[PDB]
Design a protein around this ligand. Structure first.
Ligand SMILES: N[C@@H](Cc1c[nH]c2ccccc12)C(=O)O
Ligand SMILES: N[C@@H](Cc1c[nH]c2ccccc12)C(=O)O
Ligand SMILES: N[C@@H](Cc1c[nH]c2ccccc12)C(=O)O
Ligand SMILES: N[C@@H](Cc1c[nH]c2ccccc12)C(=O)O
Ligand SMILES: [Cl-]
Ligand SMILES: [Cl-]
Ligand SMILES: [Mn+2]
Ligand SMILES: [Mn+2]
Ligand SMILES: [Mn+2]
Ligand SMILES: [Mn+2]
Lengths: 453, 443, 443, 453
């Protein structure tokens, strides 16, 4: 009933399923009693109401997928597979569309083909998708004098007061959008978009028309010839038709992640899983060792990652390892270094040494974005490439596994600067400069060479 | 906002759709200008706004799955596969939960094992799920004097006036629930719920504890032995770990179906319109007016479609459906869904089949043994309608191509456990029917 | 030369063998210095010359197939596969032809389908073929007063003195015939004769025209339905197109077996000796002297081996065989082949099984229902020995691991069609036995 | 009973199977009434006796294999697969040993891996093995004053009179040796020797230790990376474990090839097949258009090839096409050019044009040996490579398919001259210089480059 230009969709009040068990609830309550940074400031009663809704909705992922990912990540940890993680820096509800989702899935796949060939081993494909709807902020008041935008799960991007109020109905809107995206993602990956031959064709079309193309023709051709070799040998080409794309996001809004907790079915044992995603990580600003995010990560069975910035000490890294991998399950923990290209060569070696000596097997993954940011906020492609380069140099020097990358990207032709010639044009992100389709593929070729190198 | 128990969606600055090929536009407007039975009566302007929202959401299904289905249904049409369709008579937002969905997916898969074994050919598995949120009514006002319940996509089940107001915001709720359900059925089918060995284990648990169990032990053991045979022969079994479950519902609310249209990139001779609210949809008895909106809408979409055929069907009208809906003679584009009562199917269906077979088109003949037979149905009349249906086809040499059944995973009933519709067979009776029909397929 | 109906092979400038690892040499000479029963009596010098020829020919089988077999037999030993061994009682050079070989391969495969279905687990298929050219005799002189026929590897079947002279040149003829037969069984099994669907079709033709057919229709149909189930589930079926048929014979003529030894490149802890005249060989009742050449020879080769156990077997001797021949406790290296008469198997076999099971070694228990029961055998006593054998294992909780049977593709019998041995079951009776044993496996 | 050093093995006289049918026999008799060049000169009665023996022995190959090869050759003819044919120039009974047979099968496989990768399409693998026991001679009396050696099927290599008498018992000895070799070949190819990963390892070991190695490191590495790509993608690696190696030889001794004729089983129709081999070809000296070899080829259903030398006219080639492919079955006929590297660029184009205009699809295959022969008879590697090079140049100029190679080789480290530095050392052939293991693999790398080229 609006003169508004807004439809109001009623949130159906549906009877609840039985509660989670008690031991697990006591554990959980004790974890969530810890202080949590960067939480939305909506009322408790509204929060509980919205949580209750989410407690009975169909999950975004199911436990047995997560168990599967855990096994695949174990191989990454042991130096036999490589982790590729990429997607929007922030999803918006506005752009949570087929074209945009297709675009990101295809950019990620395109990268995966090149990395799989370059690494010469399987690539675990993890999208920042289907829930990356919440972000920290350091500042309470933005350049316009407004409450900061904290992502669509918390408030709206529009530069006005009303949009910036923290509204917990966005938890439900968030769930609907994540669920819908994930449905699309499963559909696309199982019905042809993730066909290897098709994906590499896009790679050839890139090499043929990009101004940088010439640089990557040899490797592109070599991949092509790899592929044809497979037909030529008459392989059962079934596993070439589909690919698995896992969902991930920063676990930031605890009202959301706790509402999406589920207990798996007996057949070992039933465990607590966060079914909002397949894997989640904890950001720089919320990884307080005695805070609720880390404690939450302790209780869930999903694989998890922690972002490690320039202030990290090898001692604190070791504590993360002891809190988050208390059973020595290889690949249950990923430590994600993001330090800046100027710093990674010095800062990372001691951390790796100290963590390796623990006997635990973590995944070392490089986030070359969140360390290299300087009208618009932009990042230089060269400094991005160089951080991955240094990251590889650390591991090669130490005999450890450079296990993957974490990268912020899109399928759109946006405008980061320096792929081939680069901002006022197409700066579309609701956050950080998002390394357009062409740059992420270039990075993939450059990292492939670091792997053959 | 939360305070008001609503999610507020702004419509201005929503991603729009590109313009249709002039000609699809024209054809689609022409189809929808025709009269449409059983439509909700909410205001145009509110409907438009809701449609505009759905025009920008992720689809429930994608074109290439629907194209894959079409090929699988072509095998059925040709007498080389069998179609099993089943699920809730009506889904409700209140039961759109992980256990309820698991249960239905399980029940369906359990049927499919038994049917696959008894048919000796693949079974195309289509659930009534992720959209079966709208039903027709013969009366406007019900037994309590209220505006009839028409399914959660239109109004609410509660017995009060305000709950029965037609609410367009239910288009968007219906979408969210559908796509959430679809996400789950894809996850489950691809990650272990659809493992053949696990599914038959439940059949074995049913045979061993149902009071009917005895009756079906022999067949259940034979199936078990057939499965073990597969390991014994070392046949490579990724294909035994997953199954495909396609989504379907009655295409009833044209405001919903039209908003979920999308255009393919093309490839068999140009761009097509696909209804991406489902993989396949059918048109019911009360909306199949030959020059009505629903039939004409079915003509403009690429999806496979079916049409329910009741006791007053003539062979001539059946032929007209076939010529309108299968104008290119694509096997399996059209399913004729017979629902006639077990007392009538033996007499009424043969002439229809003969006339239609003489057109040279290859439809799927599917038996809906429910909608012809508290409101309850006798199991024996249901089984008997499928039995009569099988006799017709045996007599004529035609393919008895499938069944369409209304069921659940729940232990439903009579005052005991009656749960938004006509009476499902419960999970047990579904399985039992599957066993019974597998004997029809063997005999 | 042709004029003399001979092929002339020069021995000087023949490719020699490299020297054995000193230690295999020593062990092999020690084994062969032991006394050997049932050996041909031809001159040393002629034997040596023939051996020298065989030392340089292509092997009949290669080490890695024998290693593959060992792994498949380990599954049998563990109660997870079943061993079917069968073929001519004695091959003859005169029947070593494409139709006769096809027939036997067919009959064996036909049995294997039925057994695979009835066992509900893989069947390891081992033919008596490509070398079963030597037999023991209890008498030196036969009913006609002639030196007994001992198989075409030693002398001729014709009833005359010159034909019964032991002729060492038969070692080389035996090799040529064996390797020619093996070539054919590999070709046939890999190129369509071993297609599961084609093989069951013959079973279906048997059920439909044998006068016994009625008896086996139910099972044959169940199998057929099990097969169709496999297509129906879309399971990928290269594995349904081919089968492995392993070669075996009684290791009897030590001049032959020793000349066909070859040395592996190694890999489980050094180089081994493999008898490449076959994949697997067994030692008969009359040559299994515990401190004799044959047993000691079996100890020096890597192949899987079996030993025939007759009515006078003690549990203690059985244990000694097991400790000598399976000294490393490798499941499936050793097959104990029980052959006791149907009147005796129920009493004599349990104690043997118990004692041997208590050693913690895992042998394969195989039933040879022939050699314990014109010289003819009653089908009913044969079936009954396998039946008794199954009862023993059911009673003890042990695996009834397989059968060893003497058969053919030919329509043999009694004065009508008697064809170099004891009476085979003919092709029909083999199949019938397979059906009968598959019921034992199901029941 | 010898003071001789010879064992005499009796040839068992075994009852016969039913005869071939009559139509097919009349056809056959009329074919064999034609004159035949280069036949052994043993008596007719001895010949018939030995033929009768061979008529009932188990066949060397079976019809359904041959049908399969026909289909695979159809794809070669249509430009979608590549034919590799190689082995001993002449097999001997002496060397018909496991080591030697393993050696040749592995050399052929090693070639196939490189060619399969370079061609980017399947390679049909055809050995000169299991019957290549007979050769033509131009001269009646050799340099020693003896009747020429005509191969082990006909007489013996030893420089003495008695050995050189043509003895038809060698038909049976030939059959036994061919049968035994073929048995080995099936065993090896089905049980691990033909495993792709294993074979390429030998290729890497070659690249690492050959003095030419350095030349081929890039391609070798690129293949390796192709292979690892296959694991990395998780392909059903079953078709990587085994390979098909067909048997072939020159059909020269008609007493042999006719004795090995068999009629296939009904299920189209039963046909005459020569089961001494999978495919056979007719040499330069026996391809008289109205002779028995060509007529024999007409009656059998096997795929066949004809060698085409420098005297070939495009007209005569067309006649071969019309006699031997009268039903237009693609790949039933292979025309095998062997012209010399100095001549192939001029002589071959007109032949191809004239044959292409017939509408038939033959396979064009290059025999770069039998045209480049000059104490010992040797061939220069460079002239061998150059003929293949020219052969490719003809087809590239004409838009036709360069369909394969036919090459004489071995697994032995023999001494041809010029792989890396090359005769008195290891000249072991009973015929023409046989291009040792290392040279044939080098040729394979060089031809691979012609295919990517
Ligand atoms: N399914 C395999 C191979 C594959 C299919 N499509 C892909 C797309 C990109 C990379 C690899 C693939 C994998 O995921 O690795
Ligand atoms: N994938 C095959 C076999 C199969 C797997 N799981 C199943 C469950 C039910 C029936 C069949 C199956 C199919 O869906 O048909
Ligand atoms: N390859 C499987 C299945 C099979 C193929 N052909 C067969 C013939 C008989 C029995 C089984 C089979 C096996 O040999 O066991
Ligand atoms: N079987 C496939 C792949 C293969 C297996 N082993 C090989 C050896 C060489 C070349 C290819 C192969 C083929 O023959 O092509
Ligand atoms: Cl009221
Ligand atoms: Cl006498
Ligand atoms: Mn970011
Ligand atoms: Mn209904
Ligand atoms: Mn016997
Ligand atoms: Mn030559």
């Amino acid at each position: 009933g609006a003169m508004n230009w807004t439809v109001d969709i009623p949130i159906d009040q549906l009877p609840s399923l039985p509660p989670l068990p008690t031991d697990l609830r006591t554990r959980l309550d004790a974890a969530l009693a810890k202080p949590a940074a960067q939480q939305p400031t909506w009322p408790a009663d509204q929060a509980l109401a919205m949580r209750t809704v989410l407690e009975s909705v169909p999950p975004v992922t199911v436990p047995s997928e997560i168990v599967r990912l855990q096994e695949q990540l174990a191989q990454v940890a042991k130096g036999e597979a490589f982790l590729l993680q990429g997607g929007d820096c922030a999803e918006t509800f506005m752009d949570n569309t087929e074209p945009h989702i297709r675009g990101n899935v295809r950019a990620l796949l395109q990268m995966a083909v090149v990395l799989t060939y370059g690494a010469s081993m399987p690539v675990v494909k993890v999208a920042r998708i289907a829930g990356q709807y919440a972000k920290p902020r350091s500042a309470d008041i933005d350049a316009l004098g407004l409450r900061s935008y904290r992502g669509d799960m918390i408030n709206g991007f529009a530069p006005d007061a009303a949009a910036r109020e923290h509204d917990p109905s966005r938890l439900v809107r968030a769930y609907a959008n994540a669920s819908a995206a994930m449905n699309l993602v499963r559909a696309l990956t199982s019905s042809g978009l993730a066909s290897l031959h098709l994906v590499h064709d896009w790679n050839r079309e890139f090499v043929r028309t990009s101004p940088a193309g010439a640089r990557y023709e040899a490797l592109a051709t070599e991949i092509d010839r790899g592929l044809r070799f497979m037909s030529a040998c008459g392989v059962a080409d079934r596993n070439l038709q589909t690919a698995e794309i896992y969902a991930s996001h920063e676990a930031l809004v605890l009202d959301y992640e706790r509402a999406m907790l589920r207990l798996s079915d007996g057949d070992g044992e039933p465990q607590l899983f966060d079914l909002s995603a397949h894997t989640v990580w904890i950001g720089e600003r919320t990884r307080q060792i005695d805070g609720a995010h880390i404690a939450f990560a302790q209780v869930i069975a999903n694989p998890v990652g922690v972002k490690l910035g320039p202030n990290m000490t090898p001692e604190l890294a070791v504590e993360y390892v002891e809190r988050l991998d208390p059973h020595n399950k290889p690949g249950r923990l990923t430590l994600v270094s993001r330090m800046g290209n100027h710093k990674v060569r010095d800062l990372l070696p001691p951390i790796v040494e100290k963590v390796q000596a623990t006997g635990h097997q973590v995944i070392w993954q490089c986030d070359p974005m969140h360390g290299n940011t300087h009208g618009f906020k932009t990042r230089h492609f060269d400094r991005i490439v160089d951080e991955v380069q240094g990251f590889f140099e650390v591991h090669r020097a130490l005999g450890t596994h450079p296990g993957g990358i974490h990268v912020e990207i899109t399928g759109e032709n946006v405008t980061l600067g320096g792929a081939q010639d680069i901002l006022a044009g197409r700066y579309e992100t609701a956050c950080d400069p998002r390394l357009n389709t062409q740059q992420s593929l270039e990075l993939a070729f450059l990292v492939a060479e670091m792997l053959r190198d």
